[PDB]
C-alpha cells in the first residue's frame, strides 16, 4: 500500500488566483488537486501545517485525512486552510482512482447519468469572441440566441453588480433597478421560454434592496437567485426566500456539512450550491449532496475557476442522483484551459461529461513549467 | 492627514505561531498588530491581497477598512484572512491612539474600571511556572500558590488526552474519574476561594460532553469552555440545558455575524472572544456591546502573544460587561519580557494596561538582533 | 485630565420643545447637547438626579456614564430620564472631540463616506416658501418637481394622519383611504421613478386599518412604512410586515440596545430608525447601528428636531457602514436653524455632511441669550 | 356634570422622592394622587403637558383620559411621563369614588375579600423597626418578631451589596455563602412558619443570577423578584427554568403592553405591579385581570407613600387573583401617620382599606404647616 512522500504546490504567475497541488507517493502515483483565490495563503498553509500531517501516510485514508486536516481555526468558512484542505483532497481522490483503475465518479458510488446539462456563466476571457460579460451588459438578446444555437439552454448573468458599490448594498434607485432589468427584457424578447436565466448577486446586497430586486424579478420568471445576501448569518435568509418567486441558490461561500446543515435548517434554499475546492473537497461535497437530497433539494456544483475543479465537479455531477446542472464557462474551456491539461471535460449539445481514465482523467501536461512562469514549492 | 506607506510582517522562528504586523505612515507614525497560529498563511494573505487595499489609505478610517478587508471567502470564521485582518486592525487602533494622544481604551469609549480581575490559564512556558504539569499532578499546590499571589481563578484542561483515543465520541467511566481528580485536589486545598473554569478545546462530541458536564456538576465549576466544536451552533442548547456551569464560547468564532449566531441559540453564558481571531478590536468592540444586550459578560482571550494581551486588556477596561481578562503567568513573567517596551501589570489578581497612547507598547527597538525574525515588506 | 464642574440647561421660550445642555469642565472645555419634546421634564430630571452623578467626574468616561445614568425606572422607553441622558451624552461626545481635536465621526471609528444622501421630511416652518406640509396635502406633484430640482431624491409624507383621530386608529373608510392616496398619485404622475417616497404613520394606527392601508399602498411602490402601528408590544409587528410590500421602518420611539434587540427578534423591520436624542445618546446609537448591520439592516438617523441632533446624527451617518439616509427638513436648515448656531450641516445636491471642526463642529452662537428668551438653569 | 378646574402638585422636601397631586373640580370635589421617585421630573411633566389635556374635562372619563395622556414618547416603561399619568389617574379614581359615594374597590368591581394577607418589606425608616439592619445581622430575631405580630411573610435583599463591585456580572462563592446567612438564621428560628421572598433590585446579569438561584434552591424561597433587569424580556425564561422559586416581575414594567410582553415569556410566576409606576389604577385593573387568564397572582407594590399603599389595597381587595399586599411597618406605624387623615389597618398579618368613598383618606388639612412643601399650580 501507498505512502505519501512529497507535496508540490504550483502557483502559475499568469493566472495568479490559481493553485495546483501535486501529491507524490513511493510507488510513483501522483495526484492532482486545485483551488482558486488566495493562492499564496492556501500554499503557505499547506506547507506550514497540512503537508506534515500527511507526509508518511496512506493517501487512501481519505476520510481520516479530511478529519485530521480540520484544524483548530477556520473550520466554519472557506478560508485559506479550507481551500488548501480541499485541493489536497481532490488530489487524494485522483490517487485513489489511479490506484484502483477507477474514475472518480465510480469511487463516489457510480454514475447515475452519462452527461449532465450545463449552464453558461457569462464571464469574459482571462488574459476572445466569447465576450460574454459585455455581451450580457449590452447585447443580451444576441448572447441568448448565440447560446441557444450551440445547444446551451441555461445562462447565468449578474447585471445588478455595478449598483452595489455606491451604497454598500443598502440601496438601489428605482430607475437604476429598471436599467439592470434590461438584460432580462432583451432575452425574453429573443428566445423567451427556451432559456433558463440564473441571477448571480455575489453576496453584494443587504436585505431591503434584495427584497426590492426580487419583487422586480418576479415578472421574468428567473430560474434561481444566487447569493442574494451575504451568507454570514443564515437566519436572515428565510426573509428573502419568502419574498422571492425564484428559489434561493446557496452557496459557494459555504464550507462543509456543518455550513450546509446550517443552510438546510433555514428552510430557505431551493438549490444547494457548493464549490468542491472551497467547501472541504470531494469528501465534504459527497456528503453535502446526499444531505441536500434528503431535503428534496438538488445540487449544482460551482466551476468558473480552473480546469481541475471543472473536471472534479463533473465527476460529482455524474455521481450525485440529485445533481441538476454543472456550471461551465465557454470562454474558459474553448479558451485558456486548452493548453494547461492533457484532457478536458467535453461539452456537446448543452451537456458536459468527464474525460476518460482513472481518477480525474487528466494530468497537468508534462511541459507545463516551460509554458507558464510557475512558482513551485516543495515539502 | 495620514496615509499608509508600508506594511511589515515579522515572523520570529523561536515563536513560530506568532505574527507581528507593523503599519507605517507618511508622518512616521507606526502601529503594532499581532496574531497567533498559522503565521505563514496570515502573512501570505496580508501581502497577497490586504496590503494593496490599505497602502495609500487613511489609517483612521478603521470601520471603513474592516469592511473593505472583509473579502469574498473566509468571512465566517477565524481563517488566515480573518487573523490577518485582525492583526491589521489592532495596528490601526495603535495609530489612532498615537495620532490623538489617547490610549486604546479611551478611543473605545473610555474606561469603566482602572484594573480588571485576571485569571490564570495554567499552561507551561514556551521555548518556576510549570503550570500544565502542576494541574495534571500537583493541582492542590498550584491552587495554593495562585491564591498567595492573589489570583482567585484558574483555567485547566484535564479531559484533553482522553479525546484522541475515541475522536471525542467516548470517555470511559474510570478515565472520567481520573480526569476528575484535578478538581477534587483543589476542592480540598482552597475550596470556596478559587473559581475553576474548564477548557475543553472543542474536542468532544455530544454524548460524552453531556456525560462530562453531569460529572462536573458536583464541583461547582465556574464555566465550561468550548465543550463541543462550534461549527453548527444549533447543537449547543442541548449541552447548555444539561450543564450546571454556564457555557463559555468561543475564541474560534469570528465577527458580529458569528456572535449573532451564538446569541440566537440562548445557550451561552459567557461570550468569549479573541481579538486576533475574531475581526480585530473593530469587531470585538461591537460583539461586547451586543453581548451586554443579552445580559452576558465578555471574557477576552489571551494565552498568546504580548500585543494581544495588551489590546484585550484595553477592551476589558472599556467594556461595561467585561468579566475577567485571561493571562498566563509563565508568559508575562517569562518570554514576553524581552520582546516589548512595556507590559500589562499584574498585581493582586488584577491586570491593567501599560501607560501611554495606543497600545502603550512597541516592539523592542533591537528586536531583529535578539530574535531570528523573517521579515516581509510591502509599500508604495 | 478633565473634571466636570457645571451643567447648564437652556430652554428657549420661542422653541418650547427644544432643550440644550452645556457641560462645563475645569479646563474650560464646554460640550453641547440637545434633545426634543418634554423640555421641562428632561431639564428637571437632569438637575434632580443626573447632574449630581456626573459633577466631579471625567467626562471622557462616556460608556461608564451612560451605564451609570441608566436609572431604576424609565430605562425601557424614550421618557424624560432617557431624553435627558441622551442630551448629556451628545455633549460628552462634544467634549471628547474637543479634548482630542477630533470630529465625532472619527471618535465613532472614522468616516465611511464624505457625504450621505438626504431625504426631505415635508414639515412646514416653526414660528416660509417651504410650506411642505400643505404642499404634500394639496400640491404634491409641485412639491416633488421642486424637490427633485434641488437634487433631493427622497421625501417623507404623512397624509393618513387626519383620519386617525375619528376612530382612535381602529378604522379608515374606503373613500377616506382613496383620498389619502391622492398625494401618491400626484407624485407618481409628476416625477415617477425618480423619487423615493417614505410614509410616516406616527404610531397612530392599530392592526386592521394598518393592513388595509398597506394593501392600498402596494401599487405605489413606497420606499418604507414608518411606525405603522404603535411600538409598545413588538410581537404585533411581523403581522404587519408580512402584509406590507414596503419594509417596516422602526422606530424613533424606541430606546437603547434592549429596545432594539426586541425589534430585531421580531424579524419584521427592514430599516432600523433611531433618534440619538431619544434612544440613549450617541453611545447607544453607535451600538444599535452595528447591531442592525449584523441583521443586514440599514440605519436611518432621525432629525426633524433641533440643529444639534441633525449635526450629531450626520456624524453617526458618516461613521456607520450601514447608514442609508440622513433625515433633514429644508424649512428647518434654510429657516430657523440659521440664527442659532455657529455652523450647520451643509446640504448640496441631495446630500449632507458635517460642519468642520472637533466634536460637533458647531457651538451655540455667543449672543444666544440676547437673541432668544432663554430660561437657564444651573447645577 | 363635573369639570376639572385646577391641578396641584405637592413636593415635601423631607420626603424628596414623594409627589402628591390634587385634582380640583367645579363642584368642590378634589382627588388625591401620588407617585414616587423623580418627583421634580414627574411634576414638570404634569404642568408642561398633562394638565392642559385635563383642565376643563370630565374627570369621570377615566379610561378616555388614560388613553389621551399616553403621549408620543415614554409609553414603554415607568418614566416621568408614566409616573405623572399614574398619579393623575389615582386622583381620578378618588373623584369617581366621592361623586358616587363608593370606595375604589367597589368601582373596580367590588371586593372579593374583606382583608388581604400582608407581607413585610424589611426596609429601615425614612427621615423600633430597624428592619434593614435587622435582616443584615439579626435575621432570626426579626423573623420571630414579625411572627409575634402575625405577619407570615418577609421580603429581604441581602445580595445587593455584592452587585456594585462587579456591575452584576460576578459573585464570589464565599460572598454568596455570606449572603446566604440571612436565610439560614430564619430557617433555624421560624422555619416552616415564614415565607421569604428575595428582592434582587434588577442588579444581576445572567450567569451570577443563575448561580444565586441555584444556591437559594435549598432554602425553599417563596419568590425571586426582579432577578435580572427587565429591559428585553426574552432573557427571562432562561432564569425561570433554573429557579425553584417562581419569578416575581416587575414594578419596573408599565401598562398592559409591558405586561403582555412579560406574559408571553412564560417565565413569570407572580405578576408584580406598582400602580404609581405602571399607568395608574386604570392599567393595573386590567393587568390583574390579564394575569388571571395566565393563572398568575398579582402582588401590588408599595414600600413607598401612603396614598399608593391605600390605592393598592383597594386593588388587592378587588382582584380575584390578588396574592399579598406589600406593606412596611416602619412606614405605616412611622412616618405615614402625620400626613393623612386615615391609614390602611394592619392586624394579624392582614391589611384592609380605610372606610369611605374613593381612597378613604385625604391629606391632613394643615399639611403645608407641618411639612415644608413646594407647591405648583395650573388652572383655567
Ligand atoms: Na457564483
Ligand atoms: Na481557550
Ligand atoms: Na418619524
Ligand atoms: Na421591590
GROMACS .gro file of N, CA and C and ligand atoms in nm, chain A residues 72, chain B residues 155 199 201 225-226 251 272 301 326, ligand 2:
model
   31
   72UNK      N    1  -0.779   2.372   1.414
   72UNK     CA    2  -0.839   2.439   1.530
   72UNK      C    3  -0.919   2.566   1.495
  534UNK      N    4  -0.790   2.845   3.488
  534UNK     CA    5  -0.839   2.758   3.382
  534UNK      C    6  -0.752   2.635   3.361
  578UNK      N    7  -1.161   2.419   3.038
  578UNK     CA    8  -1.141   2.433   2.895
  578UNK      C    9  -1.152   2.294   2.831
  580UNK      N   10  -1.137   2.258   2.468
  580UNK     CA   11  -1.071   2.272   2.337
  580UNK      C   12  -1.148   2.223   2.215
  604UNK      N   13  -1.591   2.571   2.879
  604UNK     CA   14  -1.545   2.644   2.762
  604UNK      C   15  -1.526   2.551   2.642
  605UNK      N   16  -1.579   2.594   2.528
  605UNK     CA   17  -1.582   2.516   2.404
  605UNK      C   18  -1.603   2.365   2.423
  630UNK      N   19  -1.360   3.143   2.137
  630UNK     CA   20  -1.242   3.200   2.069
  630UNK      C   21  -1.233   3.164   1.921
  651UNK      N   22  -1.701   3.457   2.493
  651UNK     CA   23  -1.557   3.463   2.479
  651UNK      C   24  -1.516   3.499   2.339
  680UNK      N   25  -0.988   3.659   2.528
  680UNK     CA   26  -0.888   3.553   2.524
  680UNK      C   27  -0.749   3.613   2.508
  705UNK      N   28  -0.815   3.695   3.072
  705UNK     CA   29  -0.717   3.586   3.064
  705UNK      C   30  -0.573   3.639   3.064
 1520LIG    NA1   31  -0.908   2.869   2.518
   0.00000   0.00000   0.00000
